[PDB]
Every structure is written in C-alpha cells, then in structure tokens.
PDB file of C-alpha atoms and ligand atoms in Angstrom:
ATOM      1  CA  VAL A   3      81.801  65.342  97.761  1.00 54.19           C
ATOM      2  CA  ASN A   4      84.206  68.706  96.811  1.00 49.64           C
ATOM      3  CA  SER A   5      85.369  71.028  93.718  1.00 51.86           C
ATOM      4  CA  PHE A   6      89.433  70.383  93.997  1.00 51.92           C
ATOM      5  CA  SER A   7      91.036  67.689  90.814  1.00 46.95           C
ATOM      6  CA  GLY A   8      93.824  66.251  90.471  1.00 43.36           C
ATOM      7  CA  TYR A   9      95.416  66.120  94.292  1.00 45.51           C
ATOM      8  CA  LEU A  10      97.553  62.835  95.356  1.00 45.72           C
ATOM      9  CA  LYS A  11      95.827  61.726  98.776  1.00 46.52           C
ATOM     10  CA  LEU A  12      98.299  60.856 100.801  1.00 47.08           C
ATOM     11  CA  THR A  13      96.448  60.878 104.253  1.00 46.75           C
ATOM     12  CA  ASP A  14      92.511  60.433 105.212  1.00 43.61           C
ATOM     13  CA  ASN A  15      92.424  64.305 105.231  1.00 46.83           C
ATOM     14  CA  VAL A  16      95.787  65.561 103.735  1.00 45.95           C
ATOM     15  CA  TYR A  17      95.916  65.838  99.947  1.00 47.76           C
ATOM     16  CA  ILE A  18      98.174  67.574  97.867  1.00 48.35           C
ATOM     17  CA  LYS A  19      98.422  69.276  94.296  1.00 50.36           C
ATOM     18  CA  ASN A  20     101.294  70.610  91.677  1.00 48.33           C
ATOM     19  CA  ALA A  21      99.505  74.259  91.583  1.00 48.74           C
ATOM     20  CA  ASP A  22     100.149  77.517  91.881  1.00 48.65           C
ATOM     21  CA  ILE A  23      97.692  78.246  94.563  1.00 46.65           C
ATOM     22  CA  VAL A  24      95.990  81.770  93.204  1.00 48.88           C
ATOM     23  CA  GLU A  25      95.348  79.590  90.176  1.00 48.95           C
ATOM     24  CA  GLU A  26      92.997  76.792  92.434  1.00 47.47           C
ATOM     25  CA  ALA A  27      91.652  79.603  94.037  1.00 53.66           C
ATOM     26  CA  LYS A  28      90.345  80.677  91.094  1.00 56.15           C
ATOM     27  CA  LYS A  29      89.055  78.026  89.686  1.00 53.60           C
ATOM     28  CA  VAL A  30      87.856  76.073  93.046  1.00 54.23           C
ATOM     29  CA  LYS A  31      86.177  79.112  94.424  1.00 55.45           C
ATOM     30  CA  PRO A  32      86.552  77.518  98.120  1.00 53.12           C
ATOM     31  CA  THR A  33      85.457  78.549 101.333  1.00 49.85           C
ATOM     32  CA  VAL A  34      88.769  78.665 102.880  1.00 50.82           C
ATOM     33  CA  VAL A  35      92.027  79.766 101.182  1.00 51.35           C
ATOM     34  CA  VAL A  36      94.879  79.735 103.731  1.00 53.91           C
ATOM     35  CA  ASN A  37      97.360  82.945 102.931  1.00 51.08           C
ATOM     36  CA  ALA A  38     100.843  82.301 104.598  1.00 48.46           C
ATOM     37  CA  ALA A  39     100.927  86.013 106.372  1.00 46.88           C
ATOM     38  CA  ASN A  40     103.106  87.713 108.917  1.00 45.57           C
ATOM     39  CA  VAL A  41     101.891  89.502 111.806  1.00 46.60           C
ATOM     40  CA  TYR A  42     101.506  92.291 110.576  1.00 46.95           C
ATOM     41  CA  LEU A  43      99.357  90.851 107.866  1.00 47.66           C
ATOM     42  CA  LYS A  44     101.702  93.021 104.912  1.00 44.07           C
ATOM     43  CA  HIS A  45     101.453  90.227 102.145  1.00 43.88           C
ATOM     44  CA  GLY A  46     104.824  91.804  99.977  1.00 43.12           C
ATOM     45  CA  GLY A  47     105.772  88.506  99.090  1.00 41.07           C
ATOM     46  CA  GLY A  48     105.450  84.701  98.297  1.00 39.31           C
ATOM     47  CA  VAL A  49     101.496  82.957  98.767  1.00 39.57           C
ATOM     48  CA  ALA A  50     100.310  86.546 101.036  1.00 39.47           C
ATOM     49  CA  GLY A  51     102.228  89.030  97.439  1.00 38.62           C
ATOM     50  CA  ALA A  52     100.203  86.530  94.865  1.00 45.18           C
ATOM     51  CA  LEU A  53      96.968  86.118  97.170  1.00 47.70           C
ATOM     52  CA  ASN A  54      97.347  90.215  97.239  1.00 46.42           C
ATOM     53  CA  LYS A  55      98.144  91.043  93.722  1.00 44.74           C
ATOM     54  CA  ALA A  56      95.203  88.848  92.632  1.00 45.58           C
ATOM     55  CA  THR A  57      92.465  91.240  95.028  1.00 48.55           C
ATOM     56  CA  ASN A  58      94.041  94.017  93.050  1.00 47.12           C
ATOM     57  CA  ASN A  59      95.378  94.826  96.599  1.00 51.51           C
ATOM     58  CA  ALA A  60      91.787  94.878  98.391  1.00 49.08           C
ATOM     59  CA  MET A  61      93.293  91.668 100.228  1.00 48.35           C
ATOM     60  CA  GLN A  62      96.005  94.111 101.968  1.00 48.54           C
ATOM     61  CA  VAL A  63      93.722  97.349 102.151  1.00 51.61           C
ATOM     62  CA  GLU A  64      91.186  95.199 104.143  1.00 54.12           C
ATOM     63  CA  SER A  65      94.157  93.845 106.250  1.00 52.13           C
ATOM     64  CA  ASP A  66      95.606  96.997 107.241  1.00 49.88           C
ATOM     65  CA  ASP A  67      91.915  98.326 108.626  1.00 51.54           C
ATOM     66  CA  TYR A  68      92.241  94.767 110.455  1.00 51.70           C
ATOM     67  CA  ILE A  69      95.611  95.738 111.952  1.00 49.47           C
ATOM     68  CA  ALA A  70      94.585  99.234 112.831  1.00 48.15           C
ATOM     69  CA  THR A  71      91.371  98.174 115.018  1.00 49.79           C
ATOM     70  CA  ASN A  72      93.207  94.495 116.123  1.00 50.26           C
ATOM     71  CA  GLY A  73      97.023  94.505 116.378  1.00 47.05           C
ATOM     72  CA  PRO A  74      99.351  92.454 115.224  1.00 43.67           C
ATOM     73  CA  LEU A  75      98.944  89.278 114.933  1.00 41.02           C
ATOM     74  CA  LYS A  76     100.504  86.197 116.948  1.00 42.80           C
ATOM     75  CA  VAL A  77     103.672  84.022 115.362  1.00 42.92           C
ATOM     76  CA  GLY A  78     101.332  80.954 115.231  1.00 42.57           C
ATOM     77  CA  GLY A  79      97.917  82.869 115.320  1.00 42.30           C
ATOM     78  CA  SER A  80      95.553  83.514 112.693  1.00 42.57           C
ATOM     79  CA  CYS A  81      92.571  85.530 111.908  1.00 42.18           C
ATOM     80  CA  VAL A  82      89.852  85.220 109.120  1.00 43.09           C
ATOM     81  CA  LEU A  83      89.274  87.704 106.973  1.00 40.51           C
ATOM     82  CA  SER A  84      87.298  88.194 103.364  1.00 42.34           C
ATOM     83  CA  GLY A  85      88.591  85.642 100.966  1.00 42.62           C
ATOM     84  CA  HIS A  86      87.592  88.792  97.970  1.00 44.46           C
ATOM     85  CA  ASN A  87      87.685  87.380  94.548  1.00 44.46           C
ATOM     86  CA  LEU A  88      89.474  84.383  95.413  1.00 43.70           C
ATOM     87  CA  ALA A  89      87.727  82.100  97.991  1.00 42.83           C
ATOM     88  CA  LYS A  90      84.173  82.985 100.961  1.00 41.90           C
ATOM     89  CA  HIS A  91      87.183  83.269 102.800  1.00 43.57           C
ATOM     90  CA  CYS A  92      90.588  83.688 103.855  1.00 42.66           C
ATOM     91  CA  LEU A  93      92.605  82.460 106.862  1.00 44.96           C
ATOM     92  CA  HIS A  94      95.745  84.355 107.067  1.00 43.44           C
ATOM     93  CA  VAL A  95      98.016  82.270 109.248  1.00 43.96           C
ATOM     94  CA  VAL A  96     101.182  82.648 110.696  1.00 45.51           C
ATOM     95  CA  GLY A  97     103.729  80.066 110.162  1.00 48.77           C
ATOM     96  CA  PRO A  98     106.923  80.755 112.266  1.00 48.71           C
ATOM     97  CA  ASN A  99     109.513  83.079 109.683  1.00 47.55           C
ATOM     98  CA  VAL A 100     112.921  80.819 110.370  1.00 48.88           C
ATOM     99  CA  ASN A 101     114.929  83.174 108.597  1.00 49.83           C
ATOM    100  CA  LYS A 102     113.495  86.620 111.080  1.00 48.37           C
ATOM    101  CA  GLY A 103     114.608  84.155 113.508  1.00 49.96           C
ATOM    102  CA  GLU A 104     111.416  82.674 114.710  1.00 50.73           C
ATOM    103  CA  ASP A 105     110.688  79.363 116.763  1.00 46.87           C
ATOM    104  CA  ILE A 106     110.090  76.499 114.924  1.00 48.89           C
ATOM    105  CA  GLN A 107     108.156  75.205 117.576  1.00 49.99           C
ATOM    106  CA  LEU A 108     105.048  77.417 117.111  1.00 49.44           C
ATOM    107  CA  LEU A 109     104.434  75.362 113.726  1.00 47.30           C
ATOM    108  CA  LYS A 110     101.924  72.802 115.293  1.00 48.87           C
ATOM    109  CA  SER A 111     100.614  75.975 116.816  1.00 51.81           C
ATOM    110  CA  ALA A 112      99.908  77.767 113.400  1.00 51.00           C
ATOM    111  CA  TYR A 113      98.577  74.305 111.972  1.00 51.07           C
ATOM    112  CA  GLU A 114      96.099  73.687 114.475  1.00 51.85           C
ATOM    113  CA  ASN A 115      94.160  77.156 113.499  1.00 54.63           C
ATOM    114  CA  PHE A 116      92.675  74.366 110.420  1.00 58.01           C
ATOM    115  CA  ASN A 117      91.345  72.671 112.829  1.00 56.28           C
ATOM    116  CA  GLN A 118      88.639  74.938 113.018  1.00 53.88           C
ATOM    117  CA  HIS A 119      87.471  74.861 109.204  1.00 52.63           C
ATOM    118  CA  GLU A 120      85.943  71.802 107.625  1.00 53.59           C
ATOM    119  CA  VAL A 121      87.980  71.940 104.265  1.00 52.39           C
ATOM    120  CA  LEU A 122      90.787  74.431 103.596  1.00 52.61           C
ATOM    121  CA  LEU A 123      92.792  75.158 100.422  1.00 50.28           C
ATOM    122  CA  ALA A 124      96.493  75.718 102.061  1.00 52.48           C
ATOM    123  CA  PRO A 125     100.183  76.194 100.727  1.00 52.28           C
ATOM    124  CA  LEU A 126     102.784  74.557 103.105  1.00 51.04           C
ATOM    125  CA  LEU A 127     103.267  77.168 106.124  1.00 50.73           C
ATOM    126  CA  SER A 128     107.259  78.255 107.244  1.00 49.34           C
ATOM    127  CA  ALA A 129     108.300  76.111 104.073  1.00 45.40           C
ATOM    128  CA  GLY A 130     109.812  78.072 100.807  1.00 43.70           C
ATOM    129  CA  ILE A 131     110.648  82.232 102.156  1.00 42.59           C
ATOM    130  CA  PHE A 132     110.296  81.314 105.286  1.00 42.86           C
ATOM    131  CA  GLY A 133     113.335  79.348 105.987  1.00 41.52           C
ATOM    132  CA  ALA A 134     111.599  76.175 107.226  1.00 41.49           C
ATOM    133  CA  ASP A 135     112.493  72.326 106.159  1.00 42.06           C
ATOM    134  CA  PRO A 136     109.265  72.118 104.053  1.00 43.85           C
ATOM    135  CA  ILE A 137     109.610  68.110 104.331  1.00 43.82           C
ATOM    136  CA  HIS A 138     108.803  68.891 108.142  1.00 43.24           C
ATOM    137  CA  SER A 139     106.217  71.543 107.310  1.00 44.29           C
ATOM    138  CA  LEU A 140     104.062  68.842 105.593  1.00 43.01           C
ATOM    139  CA  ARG A 141     104.971  66.165 108.375  1.00 44.22           C
ATOM    140  CA  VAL A 142     103.679  68.883 111.324  1.00 41.05           C
ATOM    141  CA  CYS A 143     100.748  69.300 108.920  1.00 43.13           C
ATOM    142  CA  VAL A 144     100.072  65.256 108.502  1.00 41.87           C
ATOM    143  CA  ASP A 145     100.089  65.391 111.950  1.00 41.98           C
ATOM    144  CA  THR A 146      98.563  67.707 113.413  1.00 40.84           C
ATOM    145  CA  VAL A 147      95.286  69.019 111.063  1.00 38.99           C
ATOM    146  CA  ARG A 148      92.356  66.640 111.779  1.00 40.33           C
ATOM    147  CA  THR A 149      90.516  68.686 109.416  1.00 39.25           C
ATOM    148  CA  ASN A 150      89.913  67.830 105.035  1.00 37.99           C
ATOM    149  CA  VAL A 151      93.361  69.843 103.766  1.00 41.36           C
ATOM    150  CA  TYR A 152      94.140  70.554  99.825  1.00 42.95           C
ATOM    151  CA  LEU A 153      97.757  71.227  99.654  1.00 41.59           C
ATOM    152  CA  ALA A 154      98.533  73.360  97.122  1.00 42.94           C
ATOM    153  CA  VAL A 155     102.615  72.996  96.167  1.00 45.56           C
ATOM    154  CA  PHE A 156     103.608  76.005  94.136  1.00 47.18           C
ATOM    155  CA  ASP A 157     107.172  73.987  92.846  1.00 46.70           C
ATOM    156  CA  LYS A 158     107.521  71.556  90.899  1.00 50.43           C
ATOM    157  CA  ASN A 159     110.322  70.090  92.097  1.00 49.84           C
ATOM    158  CA  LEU A 160     109.933  70.223  95.465  1.00 52.69           C
ATOM    159  CA  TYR A 161     105.945  68.937  95.138  1.00 52.99           C
ATOM    160  CA  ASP A 162     108.147  65.298  93.861  1.00 55.20           C
ATOM    161  CA  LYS A 163     110.861  65.662  96.417  1.00 54.04           C
ATOM    162  CA  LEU A 164     107.126  66.027  98.742  1.00 54.17           C
ATOM    163  CA  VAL A 165     105.541  63.282  97.196  1.00 53.40           C
ATOM    164  CA  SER A 166     108.498  59.973  96.543  1.00 52.22           C
ATOM    165  CA  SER A 167     109.806  61.624 100.607  1.00 51.47           C
ATOM    166  CA  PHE A 168     106.533  61.451 102.516  1.00 54.16           C
ATOM    167  CA  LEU A 169     105.816  58.484 105.026  1.00 54.79           C
TER     168      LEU A 169
HETATM  169  O1  2FX B 201     104.244  76.250  97.346  1.00 57.57           O
HETATM  170  C1  2FX B 201     105.310  75.624  97.836  1.00 57.57           C
HETATM  171  O2  2FX B 201     106.196  75.859  96.056  1.00 57.57           O
HETATM  172  C2  2FX B 201     105.881  76.531  98.685  1.00 57.57           C
HETATM  173  C3  2FX B 201     106.262  77.730  99.485  1.00 57.57           C
HETATM  174  C4  2FX B 201     105.590  77.966 100.593  1.00 57.57           C
HETATM  175  C5  2FX B 201     105.581  79.522 100.601  1.00 57.57           C
HETATM  176  C6  2FX B 201     105.178  79.954 102.010  1.00 57.57           C
HETATM  177  C7  2FX B 201     105.036  81.475 102.042  1.00 57.57           C
HETATM  178  C8  2FX B 201     105.261  81.632 101.135  1.00 57.57           C
HETATM  179  C9  2FX B 201     106.557  81.386 100.101  1.00 57.57           C
HETATM  180  C10 2FX B 201     105.710  79.866 100.125  1.00 57.57           C
HETATM  181  S1  2FX B 201     106.767  78.796  98.569  1.00 57.57           S
END
C-alpha cells in the first residue's frame, strides 16, 4: 500500500490520473518524481520548468553543478538527483524530442530507466511540447515499465482521450 489517490488502473503496474505533477509531488512527496529532462538539464519549460519553478530554482542549481562535472546526458538516458521539496529523489529522464529531430525509437530506452525504481510519479515522456504522439508514449510505457508507475497527465482533454483509446 502507498499514498497515491484517485488513479485509474491501466495494467498490473501502470496507473493514471488527470493531475498537475507539481501539485501531485507536493501532496504525495513520493520517493521518486520523474522529470521530462533534456540532455543539458536546462529546465526551461514543461514538466522540467514547472518542477524547477516549484523548487525555487534549486533543481537548476543542482543540475548545472551535475552537468559541469559529468557532461550532458544521452537521449534515452537519465540521472538521479535530489527531489528537493517535491520528492526524495528526482529521476531526470531524456525522452526524444521530435520537435528537435530526435529518433522516436529512443522512447523505449528512456522508459527502461524507470525499471531501476520500485515506485515512480511520472509524466508522459516525449508527449506535450516533446512532439511525440501521447497515445504512443502511453503504449511504450505500459509495454516497457515493469515497476509501479503513477502517470500524472496535466491536460484534461488529453487524459480523457488516453483513457478512452487505451487497449
Ligand atoms: O501531461 C500532459 O498533459 C502531457 C505532457 C507531457 C509533457 C512532457 C514534457 C513537457 C510537457 C509535457 S505536457
């Protein structure tokens, strides 16, 4: 038993809710919140900006130190950093950005990072401003992640569409 509330069950291990991931993280304070990162950990917009804004920019300060030491992530890759005021840990995962020309085939590699954590609060990787088809991203999630994933879909209309179209 855990602390997540009002999620629809999609599969044995995947749950979904129409929720702001920031508000969800503040309420639940999960062990792991997933950030929809880029390889530079430049948290300008979307989930990264909203999460970063909610940390008062501490996520970006930590991230710049991480990049200065380690260099950029790989598309499909991840790193674990602090969750600050939102979670124990933040798993920064780089899904391919279709709007930057990145290969959508790397989405499965991105979701494999979630398997290193027993429970995660996560967004829909490569969807929204990443340019991928969110229906596809949910299918790859369900077909790749074996650990317990709580998907927070921000967009109301998109949440309804994902549930109604889910096989
Ligand atoms: O939750 C949503 O509505 C769908 C989105 C996924 C995502 C990923 C990165 C950046 C923004 C967004 S919006």
